[model samples]
Target: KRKLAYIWSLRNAAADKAGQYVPYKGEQRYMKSVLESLVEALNQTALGDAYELVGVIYDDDAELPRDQGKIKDYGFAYRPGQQWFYPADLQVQGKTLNDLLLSVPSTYRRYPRGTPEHVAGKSDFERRLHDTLVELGADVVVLDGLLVILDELVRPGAPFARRIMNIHPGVTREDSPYERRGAYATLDALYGARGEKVVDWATMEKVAVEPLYWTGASFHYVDGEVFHDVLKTEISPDDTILELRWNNFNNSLFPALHEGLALLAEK
Candidate 1:
């Protein structure tokens, strides 16, 4: 299985390699190693007929990888005019984030939930996004996290929607301690257990959270080129030892993606 080949190709600090993982703790120097390896594999002649997509929107800020590889670094073109596909200035309707907050509901998860206008704004966002994917000739798109705005990808008549990937649908985990309070997070003489807070979507910003994890890596496509949107490949420098469970979620890309290809070929 090419997917298994992809998995075996991974640097197996392998979780067998342990400790509170910071940047240098792994057998490999950076999570970028995995992507580098996948890029070569995906570029092979055999894979030529398979997907050839690039990661869009990998954060250039606070990156720990010795070299945070870009789309070109991995041998793919950055599609033209992708900014409009996920516009920041588009939200707030000519308004912007000031002392309070930018509150771009489409991009920022914490913004207001669907009102007629925001919902309308969201519909517009997806239309542009879908067109961008088509314009890029992407057969599959990549992602680091699933945001609700992504839901529109699966919305009716949305082209190339199911192929969007959230995860391998098999590899990611649910429990990591990094998720905790800020002022109260790290804990104290105050306690040894991580406290859990109940967030009522209706209470915080008055919006419910939704899952939108789809990679679009393996699906039937008539188009010559496939595309992927990327996220979560970055971690804030402020990332701390609050939890010792995982490295950047980007590491999970190797197994999930290759396995996805292998799984879909089987399908």
Candidate 2:
């Protein structure tokens, strides 16, 4: 049984009632394109047959107080003008505890004008999200950008400590030359490393996808080292790793990795 969960932050704006904004502009557009492409590609892959895609979108920080039925309808729910928040009693399609991890993608790493500075208060929202997910009995979770949130949630005595995984969009030292040499590299080197790291790391357990490349490898290594080190040191040896990569603003390498997961499941 293969189930796939996709977690992404919704684009929000000042005029947006719930502050919900279109996802095809600004930095979010990049992620939006990547996710759309992955969905399209997965539909054409062999693994697509075994995988069921479930998606969740988070609000700003205000709890919308959803009925279990409404929560189940959208896979996620939120109110307008509030920071991202999840209900403690939330349920999705009869699936509970299947919470989502939300983060700002690389496109917004520069900290967009209105973006909330990721902080401890923001973490409280995720913690409640985790509680809702756990209550629903979800064993697998996929996060977009909040690795630190996951880490905090999984601390020593936390309830859902080690059951979640974050998918990063960059490369690790074991797989990229950027970490080996504090200098630049080629697209082949970067994409190659990204592909390899996704396969290898996923084989090990679920991880955060570090989206450091838009296409090619010329400047893809930036900030990748920080993500790499965090994953290496934080993740346990016995967790499920899921990683995804992209060729540019609108392409993804995750389909191949998904196919690999399908084949491995068969074995």
Candidate 3:
């Protein structure tokens, strides 16, 4: 069986007012597009018949209150603005997409990397997720979220290795002026346009430079630095970060993902 495991963080992206979680508009649209791309990829591949969706794995921060029924309630239950729809037909072993929803808490992001607890936590979470995906027959892992699986899980010669993939909202090529990776890509590009060097989301240093005029997206294997495609778009003078984000999503991210998965399937 060819199974695809999708992992994302739903921590601050959704809200619950004593009712089901309502995903924010931007997040909902992005996630919906991801699933749509996955389906489109599957349909175009011969492996589609054997394909099964193996997860809706999430990492909600420890502060969020537990709602035991949220998984099923969120999946297959679209209340317009309240919940997003999952592809109901994609099931594993007679299990609905809701049945596959999982919450895997991460402590690595919460603790200092050098601490014993941080290392142990990363190993524990990685082991748990790896075992679950193996048991579920996952042939590939797709990530779109804040949760960063440690290098051990996707390092060269590791279990997942080249099987893990991620779609980033910036050009990842080292030669490009818009080359930015990780979470602050879009923001970094915007800041770069104003001639500020972004050290991180919170850190910046003033620098004299030519403003970056383009931003893009990349579909890449999570190990050994293999990029499937690099899609770019011109940055508008009056664009906001949100506008740039949506434009990259609609113009670059979606198409890159669809083509990337198809390329993966051909292998």
Question: What's the lDDT for candidate 3?
Answer: 0.63
Residues 1-267 of candidate 3 have per-residue lDDT tens digits of: 557888866532232111222233445333344554555555655545556677767765444234223334453233454445444454434555456667776746577776998888888888777877887778888786535555778756767777888877787877766787867787777776666665434444456667777777787877636456655666665666655666676678777776676667756
Model 1 worst lDDT run, 10 consecutive residues: 2-11
Candidate 1 TM-score, true structure as reference: 0.41
Pick out the ten consecutive residues of candidate 3 with the lowest summed lDDT.
12-21
Give one digit per residue, the lDDT tens place, for model 1 in 156-204: 5566655554332121222422222222222210122222233433453
TM-score of each: 0.41, 0.40, 0.73
The per-prediction CA RMSD against the true structure, in angstroms, equals 15.1, 14.5, 5.7
Better of 2 and 3 by TM-score: 3
Question: For model 1, how big is the CA root-mean-square deviation?
Answer: 15.1
Clashes of 3: 0
Segments of candidate 3 deviating more than 4 angstroms: 12-33, 36-50, 61-97, 107-113, 199-205
